[PDB]
Design an enzyme around this catalytic site. Structure first.
Site, PDB file in Angstrom:
ATOM      1  CB  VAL A  27      -1.085  -0.010   1.219  1.00  8.87           C
ATOM      2  CG1 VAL A  27      -0.380   0.353   2.512  1.00  8.87           C
ATOM      3  CG2 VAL A  27      -2.289   0.913   0.744  1.00  8.87           C
ATOM      4  CB  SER A  29       7.349   1.616  -1.097  1.00  7.92           C
ATOM      5  OG  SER A  29       8.366   0.894  -0.640  1.00  7.92           O
ATOM      6  CB  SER A  34       7.485  -1.325   1.952  1.00  7.46           C
ATOM      7  OG  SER A  34       7.873  -2.529   2.308  1.00  7.46           O
ATOM      8  CB  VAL A  35       3.195   0.521   4.686  1.00  4.87           C
ATOM      9  CG1 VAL A  35       1.745  -0.054   5.648  1.00  4.87           C
ATOM     10  CG2 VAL A  35       3.887   1.179   5.481  1.00  4.87           C
ATOM     11  CE  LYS A  50       6.762   2.033   9.950  1.00  5.77           C
ATOM     12  NZ  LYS A  50       6.614   3.507  10.332  1.00  5.77           N
ATOM     13  CG  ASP A 165       4.407   8.448  13.373  1.00  6.20           C
ATOM     14  OD1 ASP A 165       3.216   8.004  12.805  1.00  6.20           O
ATOM     15  OD2 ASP A 165       5.298   7.724  13.921  1.00  6.20           O
TER      16      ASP A 165
HETATM   17  C1  LIG Z   1       8.900  10.544   6.085  1.00 10.99           C
HETATM   18  C2  LIG Z   1       8.557   9.381   6.817  1.00 10.99           C
HETATM   19  C3  LIG Z   1       7.195   8.611   6.628  1.00 10.99           C
HETATM   20  O1  LIG Z   1       6.577   9.408   5.675  1.00 10.99           O
HETATM   21  N1  LIG Z   1       7.020   7.679   7.083  1.00 10.99           N
HETATM   22  C4  LIG Z   1       5.945   6.938   6.799  1.00 10.99           C
HETATM   23  C5  LIG Z   1       4.898   7.178   5.781  1.00 10.99           C
HETATM   24  C6  LIG Z   1       3.899   6.016   5.728  1.00 10.99           C
HETATM   25  C7  LIG Z   1       3.547   5.500   6.926  1.00 10.99           C
HETATM   26  C8  LIG Z   1       2.534   4.745   6.590  1.00 10.99           C
HETATM   27  N2  LIG Z   1       1.639   4.435   5.864  1.00 10.99           N
HETATM   28  C9  LIG Z   1       0.370   4.159   5.965  1.00 10.99           C
HETATM   29  C10 LIG Z   1      -0.637   3.842   4.873  1.00 10.99           C
HETATM   30  C11 LIG Z   1      -1.451   3.309   5.252  1.00 10.99           C
HETATM   31  N3  LIG Z   1      -1.523   2.886   6.525  1.00 10.99           N
HETATM   32  N4  LIG Z   1      -0.243   3.402   6.941  1.00 10.99           N
HETATM   33  N5  LIG Z   1       2.352   3.652   7.960  1.00 10.99           N
HETATM   34  C12 LIG Z   1       3.272   3.532   9.029  1.00 10.99           C
HETATM   35  C13 LIG Z   1       3.059   2.557   9.942  1.00 10.99           C
HETATM   36  C14 LIG Z   1       2.456   1.433   9.728  1.00 10.99           C
HETATM   37  C15 LIG Z   1       2.328   0.472  10.805  1.00 10.99           C
HETATM   38  C16 LIG Z   1       2.665   0.977  12.018  1.00 10.99           C
HETATM   39  C17 LIG Z   1       3.225   1.974  12.219  1.00 10.99           C
HETATM   40  C18 LIG Z   1       3.490   3.028  11.417  1.00 10.99           C
HETATM   41  N6  LIG Z   1       4.176   4.308   8.850  1.00 10.99           N
HETATM   42  C19 LIG Z   1       4.555   5.327   7.973  1.00 10.99           C
HETATM   43  C20 LIG Z   1       5.630   6.134   7.841  1.00 10.99           C
END
Ligand SMILES: C=CC(=O)Nc1ccc2c(Nc3cc[nH]n3)nc(-c3ccccc3)nc2c1
Ligand SMILES: CCCCCCCCO[C@@H]1O[C@H](CO)[C@@H](O)[C@H](O)[C@H]1O
Length: 337
Positions: A27, A29, A34-35, A50, A165
């Site tokens: 979904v 990266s 990557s998630v 993730k 965050d």
């Molecule tokens: C500059 C750094 C940055 O943008 N980091 C991101 C970006 C997206 C993250 C993310 N995305 C999504 C998509 C759907 N659910 N989470 N999900 C998660 C996440 C997913 C599972 C547990 C904790 C965090 N982290 C993300 C971190």
């Protein structure tokens, strides 16, 4: 006792995850990692999993990995992103190389819910109330978000909101003092951001849609006026004072004549949030008690956080030390009820 894991190629790497997590679908990266979306058969929840990228590649990566895990383990509040699970395929510290984090799968962010249309006043009350409820909690842990914006606000189909965050220009929601690199920020930098968000939800238009960094400040001062005498007394910067001194004074606008047709209580709250002087902005706790939120406010259920030990931020440790500390945090994780 250890879950049985399975292996699957996903975003062109092998994921190794507990069998409870089914049907992984990429979904997202980036540099972070990557998630994948997944279904957690143990809880019946749709979740985001993730896989951290390069979590121990360098001292900085390793300290960032630790920081992220400590923060997510600490946040336990309905209006803040929390950790459902954290795992590693590693059976020992010796083989510990990969970190996976699990949270609720979130469909949409605040941008999606509004899509340039006015929300109703009742809906604005509910959404802002939740943001402030989560901020009271975050701020009570002596944490400042610093980058609050619609893309960092997840909202499900029941209109239930969580502060994230991670995910338009970010600059549009940033407090003027952050735009000026002031460097001793008040928690009310986040209240500024809330004010910007609330105004846009009510009007359907970005409050301060600056084209570049200086334009952003120009649009800000047009609304809130140039600095008063009380504020100027508090500016230590010689260059800033002299610049501000040179500026043809503008009064603060009357928000009642700016937000035409809005709930007067909404206007009053906006005036209290969007004050140039950060010492005079309303706090998250104070805002929750404002009459605008009468239908939602409950002092019995606006909780604060346990103290958050951020002493590790000051420490300069080796990769293997940050890795060991991170492993400790993985091993000690207890899932929520
Ligand atoms: C500059 C750094 C940055 O943008 N980091 C991101 C970006 C997206 C993250 C993310 N995305 C999504 C998509 C759907 N659910 N989470 N999900 C998660 C996440 C997913 C599972 C547990 C904790 C965090 N982290 C993300 C971190
Ligand atoms: C012309 C541009 C003027 C911008 C003025 C922003 C003033 C913000 O407010 C200031 O925030 C500081 C914390 O960051 C505090 O230390 C100061 O006490 C407070 O007045």
């Amino acid at each position: 006792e250890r879950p049985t894991f399975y292996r699957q190629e996903l975003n062109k790497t092998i994921w190794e995850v507990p069998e409870r997590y089914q049907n992984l679908s990429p979904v997202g990266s980036g540099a972070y990692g990557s998630v994948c979306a997944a279904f957690d058969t143990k809880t019946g929840l749709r979740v985001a999993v993730k896989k951290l990228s390069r979590p121990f590649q360098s001292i900085i990566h390793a300290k960032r990995t630790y920081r992220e895990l400590r923060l997510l383990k600490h946040m336990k509040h309905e209006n803040v992103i929390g950790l459902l699970d954290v795992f590693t395929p590693a059976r020992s510290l010796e083989e510990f190389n990969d970190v996976y984090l699990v949270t609720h799968l979130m469909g949409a962010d605040l941008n999606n819910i509004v899509k340039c249309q006015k929300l109703t006043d009742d809906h604005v009350q509910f959404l802002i109330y939740q943001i402030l409820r989560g901020l009271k909690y975050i701020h009570s842990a002596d944490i400042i978000h610093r980058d609050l914006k619609p893309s960092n606000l997840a909202v499900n189909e029941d209109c239930e909101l969580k502060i994230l965050d991670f995910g338009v220009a970010t600059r549009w929601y940033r407090a003027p003092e952050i735009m000026l690199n002031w460097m001793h920020y008040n928690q009310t930098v986040d209240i500024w951001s809330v004010g910007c968000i609330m105004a846009e939800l009510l009007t359907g238009r970005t409050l301060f849609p600056g084209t570049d960094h200086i334009d952003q400040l120009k649009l800000i001062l047009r609304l809130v006026g140039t600095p008063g005498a009380e504020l100027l007394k508090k500016i230590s910067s010689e260059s800033a004072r002299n610049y501000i001194q040179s500026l043809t004074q503008m009064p603060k606008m009357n928000f009642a004549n700016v937000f035409i047709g809005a709930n007067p209580l909404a206007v009053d709250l906006l005036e209290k949030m969007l004050v140039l002087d950060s010492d005079k902005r309303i706090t998250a706790a104070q805002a929750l008690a404002h009459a605008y939120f009468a239908q939602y406010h409950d002092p019995d259920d606006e909780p604060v956080a346990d103290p958050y030990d951020q002493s590790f931020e000051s420490r300069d440790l080796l990769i293997d030390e940050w890795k060991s500390l991170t492993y400790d945090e993985v091993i000690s994780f207890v899932p929520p009820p």
